[PDB]
């Protein structure tokens, strides 16, 4: 094959025992209304980002892990 993976997706599986930090990371990564964000997280799993730079992917993920949440890389 000859395909360059320069498009990664960041999905949120489990907010973990730090929904407060998650919701923050979310709004920070997106900026959706408090509600929308709430529902999103509460509607896990759910995509947070699609076709974003790897650097950004690992950045957000790292943030999730720092708080203690479960992320998914696609």
């Amino acid at each position: 094959a000859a395909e360059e993976k320069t498009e990664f997706d960041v999905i949120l599986k489990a907010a973990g025992a730090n929904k407060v930090a998650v919701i923050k990371a979310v709004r920070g990564a997106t900026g959706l209304g408090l509600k929308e964000a709430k529902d999103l997280v509460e509607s896990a799993p759910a995509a947070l980002k699609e076709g974003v730079s790897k650097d950004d992917a690992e950045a957000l993920k790292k943030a999730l892990e720092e708080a203690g949440a479960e992320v998914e890389v696609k």
Side-chain angles (χ1 to χ4, degrees), residues 2-73:
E3 285 105 284
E4 267 80 283
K5 260 191 143 289
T6 77
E7 277 179 287
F8 298 83
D9 293 34
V10 176
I11 289 141
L12 172 67
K13 279 201 149 69
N18 211 328
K19 217 185 273 150
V20 183
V22 173
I23 290 155
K24 279 178 126 170
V26 174
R27 185 186 203 78
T30 62
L32 286 171
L34 206 144
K35 185 190 106 70
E36 292 99 277
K38 184 83 97 76
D39 293 321
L40 183 85
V41 171
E42 290 269 300
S43 294
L48 266 63
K49 337 175 68 171
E50 301 189 279
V52 297
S53 63
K54 193 269 279 181
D55 286 54
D56 281 335
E58 72 175 63
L60 177 289
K61 176 163 164 180
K62 272 187 287 211
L64 274 268
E65 291 204 60
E66 282 269 75
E70 191 183 42
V71 190
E72 169 70 274
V73 175

